[PDB]
Write a protein that binds this ligand. Structure first.
Ligand SMILES: [Zn+2]
Ligand SMILES: [Zn+2]
Lengths: 107, 47, 146, 46
């Protein structure tokens, strides 16, 4: 930890004297011998995440259900709408249909 | 230095972050106002 | 090792780093425990406003600031403690409110430095200061009054 | 909220108006005091 001298208030460092390890300041003859054990834990953060991802139930966090696509007309789908282009007057669509492991990706 | 640390903050993470600054300051022989002013003047650019 | 000269932790309220083995108070409960729970006297440090609701008595004036240096001795006001924790100070027709100031943890020694002679004086340590009070005008009442 | 109890009076004293000083140590906690430390002198200016 951070310790300060009661005399002048400067930071105390740990050195070795003639009898035992002691805290001392660099601007005053104040010292303090260590009698019992002193500890300073920090408890660093541990890795809690298992880093497992990609589940089909978690992936199907989308609105698209029971629609009709021009590729395989399967019910389960995955739609995305984009409006980030002023030159294109209409909007932009991205539809994916992987109900029977098709994996389509078009505009 | 105790007054400086009290002015910075009394939180454990605050002291843990400010520790390296105190260590770098104690590495040099700057402990009074005159020495710090002399160091700054040495670092002062000519006008 | 000497017990009254150990190293002090950064937290002044938790300087007990090594051992041989605080909730924020309120002025009403403070005075209650200072008077009912115990009878020992206590030295307080309250901050009064810049101008008191009075006039300097024959001090050669102007609506200037009226501090304690102009008032005389004797009873100057009363300290009321209402319900729900209200702590007011009746200094005449108006009523100020007293709240807890910054909770100081460092040493504050109230001393009396009396320069009786022009060459040698006496410094008298009167006591220690622990709590700080703040007295403020009740501007809401002053506004709703007129 | 009426003033049920604790009707303390406030008195004023002018004996030590010009001789009262407030000394606070920003680096010394209130736990340790200078009562046992033998003092030697104090320089001061009016
Ligand atoms: Zn020191
Ligand atoms: Zn389909």
């Amino acid at each position: 930890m951070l310790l300060f001298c009661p005399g002048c208030g400067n930071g105390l460092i740990v050195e070795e004297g003639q009898r035992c390890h002691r805290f001392a300041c660099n601007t005053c003859p104040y010292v303090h011998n260590i009698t019992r054990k002193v500890t300073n834990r920090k408890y660093p953060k541990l890795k809690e995440v298992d880093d497992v991802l990609g589940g089909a139930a978690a992936w199907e966090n989308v609105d698209s259900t029971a629609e009709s696509c021009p590729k395989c007309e399967h019910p389960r789908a995955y739609f995305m709408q984009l409006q980030t282009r002023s030159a294109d007057e209409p909007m932009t669509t991205f539809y994916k249909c992987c109900n029977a492991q098709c994996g389509h990706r078009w505009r | 230095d105790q007054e400086i640390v009290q002015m910075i903050g009394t939180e454990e993470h605050v002291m843990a972050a400010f520790g390296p600054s105190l260590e770098e300051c104690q590495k040099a022989q700057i402990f009074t106002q005159m020495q710090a002013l002399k160091y700054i003047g040495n670092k002062v650019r000519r006008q | 090792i000497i017990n009254i000269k150990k190293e002090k932790r950064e937290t002044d309220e938790e300087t007990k780093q090594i051992l041989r083995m605080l909730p924020k108070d309120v002025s009403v409960a403070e005075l209650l425990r200072e008077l009912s729970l115990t009878k020992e006297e206590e030295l307080l440090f309250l901050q009064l406003p810049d101008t008191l609701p009075g006039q300097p008595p024959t001090q050669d004036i102007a609506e200037n600031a009226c501090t304690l240096a102009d008032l005389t001795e004797g009873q100057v006001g009363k300290l009321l403690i209402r319900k729900s924790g209200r702590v007011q100070l009746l200094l005449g027709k108006v009523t100020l409110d007293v709240t807890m100031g910054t909770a100081c943890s460092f040493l504050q020694e109230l001393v009396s430095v009396g320069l009786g002679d022009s060459r040698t004086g006496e410094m008298t340590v009167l006591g220690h200061v622990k709590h700080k009070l703040v007295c403020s005008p009740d501007f809401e009442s002053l506004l709703d009054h007129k | 909220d009426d003033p049920v109890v604790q009707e303390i009076d406030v008195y004023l004293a002018k004996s030590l108006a010009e001789k009262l000083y407030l000394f606070q140590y920003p680096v010394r906690p209130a736990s340790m005091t200078y009562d046992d430390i033998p003092h030697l002198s104090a320089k001061i200016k009016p």
